[PDB]
Structure formats: C-alpha cells, structure tokens
Design a protein around this ligand. Structure first.
Ligand code: SAH
Ligand code: SAH
Ligand code: SAH
Lengths: 129, 129, 129
C-alpha cells in the first residue's frame, strides 16, 4: 500500500447539529448524512466526511431551558487542498444551510488548521422576538 | 442567521469515562449525561456538552488485565469565556467526581486551548493496596 | 484520587476504518476493536484506545461512486511516552494492517503532537489496474 501524505494547509472542520426541534425529538443522523451530501454536492466539493451520533445537552437561548437531545458531530478533513477562504466559506455555508434545514436555533462550527482552532462559530437563528 | 464568533481563550476539554466496574458492564451513556448535568449545575457553569458512545480498551493498572468496555467521550467547548484556571479547575473537578460516581479506577481528562493540548491527566483512584 | 499529568511528547492518533467492502456492508466495530487489540499486542505496545462508531461518506477513487457506510474512528492517546518515530511507525503499521485485514481501498491516519497535526496520511491499496 502507498502512504500518501495529505497536501494542502491541513484544514478540517467539526459541525454540531442537534436533532431536537425545541424540546421535541425530530430528526435522525441519517437525515443529516443525506442532507449534508446534497448540500456539498451543490457546492461542487467532495462530500466525504464522518458523522458521529451523540447525546447533546444544550441551554436554549431565549427560555433558558436545558434540553438533552440526540445530535450529530460532522467531521470534515479537507482532502482537496482548498484555500483557507474557500474551505472556510464552504463549511460556513454548509452549517448555515443545516441550521435552516433542521429548524435549529444554533449550529456550532469549528474550523481547524493542522488541528489548531482558527474559529469557533455559533450560527444562530434570527427568529423575531 | 448570525455567524457569532466565539469569544474567550478558546478552551475545550475531553473526558473519557468507562462504563465497566472492573470487568463488569455496569453503566450507560445516559447515566453519564445525567450525572454530568447534575455536577455542572452545582458548579454554577453552563452544562452544555456533547457525549459520544464508544467502545474502549483499557489495561487495568493493578492486575494488567485487558478489558473492553462501553465508554463515553465527553466533549466540552467553553462558551462562557472562562479563564484558563477557572475552566481547568471546573473540568478537573468534574472528572474527579465522575471517577467517584462511576466507581472507576481511572478517568482521562484532556484540556485544550485553541485545539492545542495544555494537559492530559489520568485521574486515578487511590484504592489501598 | 491522584491527578497524574501525562508525560511524553503528547502524541496521539486518529485512524478511520470503513466497514463496507466496496458498496457491501461487511464488518462491524467490534471486528475492528478485536483486530486492533491483536495487532497492537503483536507490536508489544499498550493496546488501550477508544473506538467510535460513525456513518462515513466516501468517494471511491477508481470509479468515483459515492458510498455511505458504517465506519470506525480509532482514537489513540500515547500513555507510554514513546518517541515521535516509534509512535508514528507503530500507528502507521497498525493502519496498514487494518487496511489489509478489512479489504479497504483507503484508511486515513492522523498523527498529532499536543493536538497539532503532524501528518495526515491516506493508506491506499495498490490493487492492479
Ligand atoms: N458547549 C458545548 N460543548 C460541546 N458540545 C456542545 C456545546 N453546546 C452544544 N453542543 C453540541 O451541539 C449540539 C447542537 S446545539 C443545540 C441544537 C438545538 N436543537 C437547537 O435547536 O439549537 C448539541 O446537541 C451538543 O451535542
Ligand atoms: N490510551 C488511550 N487512548 C485512547 N482512549 C483511551 C486510552 N486509554 C483509555 N481510553 C479510553 O478511556 C476509557 C476509560 S479508561 C478505563 C476505565 C475503567 N472502567 C476503570 O475503571 O478505570 C476507555 O474505555 C477508553 O475509551
Ligand atoms: N474527508 C474526510 N473527512 C472525514 N472523514 C472522512 C473523510 N474521508 C473519509 N472519511 C472517513 O473515513 C472512513 C473510511 S474511508 C473509505 C473506506 C472504504 N470502505 C474503502 O474501502 O476505502 C469513512 O467511512 C469516513 O468515516
């Protein structure tokens, strides 16, 4: 076998997507897998990724209620050697669309370069209050 | 949606908690979720976290027996902008209490700052020998 | 309890192993656990590790087909204080053997030092074309 060293700037990302809508369990990990594939295909990017099922604990921003849900940790290693701006923008757009598609108040996105965190973002719904 | 960049020094932690007591499967991931919520509430800290089910392999320290168990990886991203000392101390106290509550010989704690590991600790029972 | 700070250069690794052979679901996480234990024992290294079940999305290299499979993320924290070369070589050998044992086209290996990625490798089958 060949020991192919990955090129590029070593970008990766983690996205956390919950599966409750409010306090109601609603979605499944496979829903997130399929939606992520669909989004990334429309970006023209290699969709390859890992999806980890989790239990998540989250404090709702508006009410302060503490909720426990199933959630998904999406792990993306850039295998295409994208620029920082290209990779970051495509991951941010994916996170923003996942938030909409799953009716989420927040989606958390973490961008890394050689494992060093460049940015952690909370993508937050602007539902009118 | 709003792309809220997380503030603070970028602290996060990982805690590994096994669910065997010795070679006996005993606990579940939901037990760890509930206990973690309870501990963190008593700390006055936001409990929000992710919990990943795993299979773990561990060599017992006293006997050298190799055990395979279910285990839990707790992932904590600091969203409150705590100081290094505050966050580190609260994570260490959580790990220490989890070790007691689940009758564990070891709990592993990893503290990161912008993804760079600051400390890896094994919290080890002092059972008399 | 004792708060034992881990020594060494802080090496760790992640290995991603799929459970499809081509487009056919074939293996299970427990197969990977058992094979990893067996390999690491023959290396004379402490086998201790964590194994995370995942859903994985992968583009096949030769055909371009997009496949969704179950997969396993192996997380290895070096607790023995190995040298960089020793740890890296033993993780690479484990990844290479896992690729063979599970009839995989690719296995992904990531080596970290204090969380900073030193290398990401794709271990790729040289099946004759
Ligand atoms: N501080 C933190 N550290 C680690 N994981 C966290 C976290 N805050 C949230 N998470 C993870 O992020 C997931 C989604 S956050 C909450 C989503 C919710 N359903 C909504 O509508 O907004 C959680 O389930 C948890 O797995
Ligand atoms: N070197 C290593 N690298 C990665 N994960 C490890 C590890 N050593 C232990 N772990 C993880 O840490 C978990 C708990 S360690 C063993 C706990 C045991 N039940 C006790 O009573 O002490 C394991 O199940 C495994 O998931
Ligand atoms: N770019 C990427 N980012 C994150 N995870 C990835 C990835 N590419 C692959 N993976 C992970 O790596 C696993 C194995 S890669 C594909 C293995 C396949 N069965 C083969 O025979 O080659 C996938 O299931 C996925 O979990």
């Amino acid at each position: 076998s060949l020991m192919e060293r990955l090129g590029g700037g070593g970008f990766s990302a983690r996205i956390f997507v919950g599966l409750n809508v409010g306090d109601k369990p609603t979605y499944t990990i496979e829903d997130v897998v399929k939606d992520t594939i669909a989004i990334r295909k429309r970006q023209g990017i290699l969709p390859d990724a890992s999806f980890v099922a989790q239990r998540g604990v989250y404090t709702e921003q508006r009410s302060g209620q503490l909720v426990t849900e199933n959630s998904v940790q999406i792990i993306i290693i850039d295998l295409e050697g994208l620029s920082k701006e290209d990779f970051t923008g495509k991951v941010q757009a994916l996170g923003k669309e996942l938030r909409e598609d799953f009716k989420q108040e927040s989606v958390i996105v973490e961008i890394q370069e050689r494992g060093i965190v460049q940015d952690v973002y909370s993508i937050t719904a602007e539902w009118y209050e």
